[PDB]
């Protein structure tokens with residue numbers, strides 16, 4: 008079974024990074040909507056952080072799998 | 077055909093005369109077409125051994141021949157003003173400026189070629205039945221009286237009407 | 247219009263006397279199948295690699311570098327490849343030649359478009375070709391020892407596949 | 421009257437449904453019509469083509485293919501300006517439709533009736549009566 | 560068959576349209592663009608600790624040692640060969656699409 | 664860019680110009696095949712096609728025929744190929760009788776004489792190509808098996 | 815140009831630019847804005863310059879708050895991860911401050927902001943060249959030192975002064 012670890016600040020770090028990464032990506036790649044202060048609303052923010060919890064969950068599970076944690 | 081036959085006829089005669097150093101310890105006492113067989117029993121692919129003698133001949137003759145393949149194909153379709161047989165080979169000036177040669181020397185080449193076709197055909201069949209080889213055959217003008225025990229060729233079927241239908245004096 | 251090297255063949259259409267190392271040798275018509283400039287770059291690449299390969303064979307007979315005998319005991323010509331894949335030497339040379347090939351690939355596309363001559367990487371640090379007449383004869387000599395080293399590299403490695411001796415050890419031990 | 425061979429053809433990208441060797445060795449049919457627009461129509465032999473504003477020209481293998489297009493061109497684009505030709509490989513061009521300038525469903529003077537039988541269909545002759553006789557069954 | 564270069568021959572993909580197949584550039588880039596990621600090792604019995612390209616490149620030589628004999632059904636050669644070429648064909652297809660069409 | 668166009672500029676002919684149909688590679692192969700190659704007599708077209716077809720015919724008859732497991736397998740396979748070649752030549756002859764009117768033209772395939780030329784070449788080439796395959800298989804043990812002599 | 819002589823001049827760069835050497839073989843300058851590219855090169859350089867010291871100095875001296883782990887590289891797995899989280903957000907605040915809300919290629923350089931400059935001054939073309947080339951060097955050196963400490967699993971100068979063991983993984 009792929010090893011997973013109990014929540015630590017390291018798990019938080021990956022999640023925070025991934026959420027911010029997607030918030031910046033969402034400002035760039037969301038085609039229909041002051042780098043983050045133009046046209047930024049809740050559906051844009053709620054979508055980029057939804058992909059952050061998808062990317063972050065995948066990254067956390069993968070880094071636990073290989074040993075990086 | 078004539079050039080190959082001239083080479084084969086001279087080759088059979090000189091093979092009877094002597095052999096190169098070390099050939100005798102490998103092939104033994106075979107004489108003409110049997111030596112073709114003997115090498116081929118000792119060569120990779122056809123036989124089992126450490127030799128590539130007939131295969132080396134096939135390799136380099138085949139390189140030359142594919143070159144002449146393109147030459148003949150070009151000459152057939154009229155793309156070239158080259159005559160038959162002319163490969164430009166005349167290293168010693170014999171035709172005095174033309175590699176094709178004079179009318180007389182190409183007539184000589186064709187006539188000697190035709191003679192050598194007949195002659196090497198005779199030599200091969202005289203060996204296939206007596207086993208003597210050119211010079212022993214020409215010496216042994218009474219023939220079938222005592223002949224050399226020589227192997228069956230790689231085409232033994234062809235020597236199967238000799239005894240049953242034909243007389244088989246041997 | 248007859249081939250110089252093969253007198254009974256027509257002069258190959260795609261071939262021209264401007265090319266370095268030209269002798270009219272393409273009896274199979276392979277200069278028409280693939281583009282002649284791609285073929286020139288391929289041949290020159292083969293020339294230079296096999297020149298290093300032949301010189302490497304010869305030099306590795308003559309001497310080895312300090313500590314090499316520690317790592318390679320009896321492996322001589324292509325056995326040293328097998329033992330130095332285990333060690334890092336072969337991977338290192340592969341990485342750096344592949345690094346160079348990336349820009350070589352850009353340069354091959356460049357010479358395809360027509361901006362660059364094949365095999366031309368502007369590498370003349372010691373100014374050997376400055377005269378403009380030496381430059382041509384150097385191009386001819388590069389292709390000549392390049393072709394000869396392709397044949398030689400093959401002819402040594404196969405001599406070593408037979409005997410195991412290597413080039414100089416084949417000669418000295420007949 | 422004669423087909424002006426130079427009339428431009430509707431923009432079409434081609435299809436496998438067009439004419440075959442029998443058109444170039446037996447006969448070919450052509451249809452011309454005037455379009456007020458540069459509009460898409462359906463080819464009888466396949467997909468869609470675009471007729472150019474002004475005069476168009478097509479070549480088809482069957483007479484029915486030219487008229488099936490004529491029906492469509494008159495029912496959806498209200499073009500009634502269509503002329504159908506038969507073309508032989510000898511170069512002879514044979515005007516076909518409408519044969520005398522007026523459509524067949526409209527009467528015209530100088531049309532002679534062909535195939536008209538003076539009695540009703542039940543008044544034909546029985547086959548036994550005309551057996552081994554050349555006499556026709558239509559009375 | 561034949562390969563056409565990036566430079567302009569008179570090759571036409573169809574009746575009247577000349578089209579430069581970029582067989583040198585696409586084949587080289589697709590090969591390298593697939594082989595280098597595929598160097599990623601994996602301690603799986605099929606790979607054996609190598610990457611997919613390298614386990615495959617290892618399996619060409621092992622079966623070449625037994626040159627007349629073909630690789631067996633359970634031999635890792637076939638799976639490695641199929642997977643390597645599947646990615647290679649895909650990168651060649653995508654590389655031809657990317658290079659010929661987008662031109663940059 | 665578009666790879667499919669109407670066939671020979673004609674949008675209304677029953678064909679398309681596709682890469683399989685009209686690429687430079689296709690045109691090359693078609694133009695250089697014996698049926699379409701220029702400078703070839705119909706007799707020579709028949710010979711080259713015949714040599715090709717007769718040569719491959721010997722193999723399926725030899726390897727998979729009824730006498731395949733016998734020592735007369737190659738003889739039976741050649742004669743089977745020879746029988747097919749003779750049957751096919753009758754097919755060629757009757758096609759010429761019913762398809763072409765008699766005209767002096769003889770350098771085209773689709774003429775009465777040109778077909779008779781092509782049929783003559785095809786029969787000679789087919790027997791020649793089948794005979795060549797017979798000679799090669801008889802003598803070379805690799806061809807007698809599927810390459811199975813090496814294992 | 816002049817760096818890779820068997821290739822063309824990029825013709826999107828010039829000797830006006832600080833660290834110019836004509837080295838753009840892949841032609842990235844053609845596909846992306848060169849103000850953004852310069853910007854990214856200066857920034858990556860400066861961060862990696864700080865990172866070279868960030869790998870060097872904690873070997874000799876590590877702050878009393880933390881525990882140093884085994885190597886200055888490995889120290890991120892032994893310091894509290896929330897400390898690195900605060901570094902991440904603090905650097906984000908600096909990005910959204912030093913850039914006046916402009917964080918995208920379309921947005922930066924709108925008022926004529928020169929790539930390197932963040933308001934710490936104006937420097938000679940030579941001085942900007944010095945920064946760029948040292949930055950490029952420390953980028954390469956950061957790659958070298960990080961993977962060195964990763965493979966050796968020991969510190970950089972301890973490895974250099976002690977037996978210079980090859981990197982093996």
Ligand code: CLA
Pocket residue numbers: 584585588589592645646647649650651653654655656657658661662663
């Ligand atoms: C497998 C490798 C691969 C992949 C995934 C891509 C993907 C992409 N390329 Mg690239 N390219 C490749 C190889 C590849 N390329 C190579 C080898 C070359 C050099 C010859 C190029 C040269 C090139 C140029 C010059 C350009 C692109 C561009 C693009 C993008 C859109 C156009 C396109 O090809 O649509 C492909 C579309 C997708 C991949 C997304 C669709 C999603 C589905 C699921 C496709 C999946 C296909 C396949 C199953 C994935 C296989 C992966 C692997 C297992 C082989 C896209 C991101 C263009 C671009 O956007 O610029 C950045 C562009 O200008 N490419």
Ligand code: CLA
Pocket residue numbers: 024027028031850853854855857858861901902903905906907909913916917918
């Ligand atoms: C809150 C975080 C944050 C934000 C919003 C920014 C914003 C910016 N940075 Mg900065 N940066 C940060 C943190 C941040 N930075 C930190 C902590 C570092 C490391 C010290 C850097 C290092 C850095 C460099 C070296 C460069 C920038 C650049 C940029 C600009 C464009 C990229 C962008 O919009 O964000 C994108 C960035 C982030 C969302 C956070 C970046 C933090 C790094 C990259 C961690 C990412 C981990 C992972 C390896 C990313 C790969 C993705 C994938 C493999 C998973 C913009 C001004 C670039 C530029 O063009 O200069 C203006 C540039 O060259 N920044």
Ligand SMILES: CCCCCCCCCCCCCCCCCC(=O)OC[C@H](CO[C@@H]1O[C@H](CO)[C@H](O)[C@H](O)[C@H]1O)OC(=O)CCCCCCCCCCCCCCCCC
Pocket residue numbers: 120121122131134799803805806809
């Ligand atoms: C007009 C003739 C034009 C060509 C003329 C060339 C020769 C003319 C002069 C000859 C006189 C000297 C005699 C030399 C004889 C040389 C004999 C020789 O070298 O043989 C050469 C070869 C092989 O024969 C032997 O091979 C052995 C190893 O097996 C050895 O290596 C020997 O080299 C070789 O003798 O014979 C052939 O050429 C056969 C024809 C080509 C076969 C190619 C492979 C088979 C392809 C089949 C795949 C197609 C699809 C199959 C479908 C599924 C099937 C299950």
Ligand SMILES: CC1=C(C#C/C(C)=C/C=C/C(C)=C/C=C/C=C(C)/C=C/C=C(\C)C#CC2=C(C)C[C@@H](O)CC2(C)C)C(C)(C)C[C@H](O)C1
Pocket residue numbers: 082083085086165166167168169170188189191192193194195196198199202209210211213214
């Ligand atoms: C061209 C070219 C050059 C060259 C060259 C070369 C190498 C030329 C070689 C020429 C040769 C070898 C010609 C030989 C012909 C042989 C004949 C006619 C004999 C046939 C046998 C008969 C009739 C018989 C018989 C027999 C019977 C049947 C039974 C047997 O028991 C015995 C018996 C023998 C009696 C050079 C290099 C000079 C340069 C020049 O610038 C251009």
Ligand SMILES: CC1=C(C#C/C(C)=C/C=C/C(C)=C/C=C/C=C(C)/C=C/C=C(C)/C=C/C2=C(C)CCCC2(C)C)C(C)(C)C[C@H](O)C1
Pocket residue numbers: 139324325327328396397399400401403
């Ligand atoms: C496999 C292996 C590895 C290796 C390796 C290496 C280094 C392999 C290198 C192989 C090479 C270079 C082979 C070259 C052969 C040359 C030939 C056939 C040319 C013949 C010329 C001819 C026929 C005639 C030409 C001509 C003549 C004069 C007459 C006519 C005119 C013309 C046509 C011009 C390693 C490293 C992994 C080690 C591992 O343990 C084993």
Ligand SMILES: CC1=C(C#C/C(C)=C/C=C/C(C)=C/C=C/C=C(C)/C=C/C=C(C)\C=C\C2=C(C)CCCC2(C)C)C(C)(C)C[C@H](O)C1
Pocket residue numbers: 109110112113193194196197198200204229230231
């Ligand atoms: C190497 C090898 C082999 C081999 C072999 C070889 C080289 C075999 C060569 C066979 C040859 C060349 C036979 C010659 C036949 C010519 C004839 C019969 C002319 C006949 C009759 C007349 C009337 C001519 C009349 C004429 C004259 C008088 C003047 C009038 C006109 C004309 C009619 C033209 C094997 C097969 C043994 C296998 C072995 O394992 C390996």
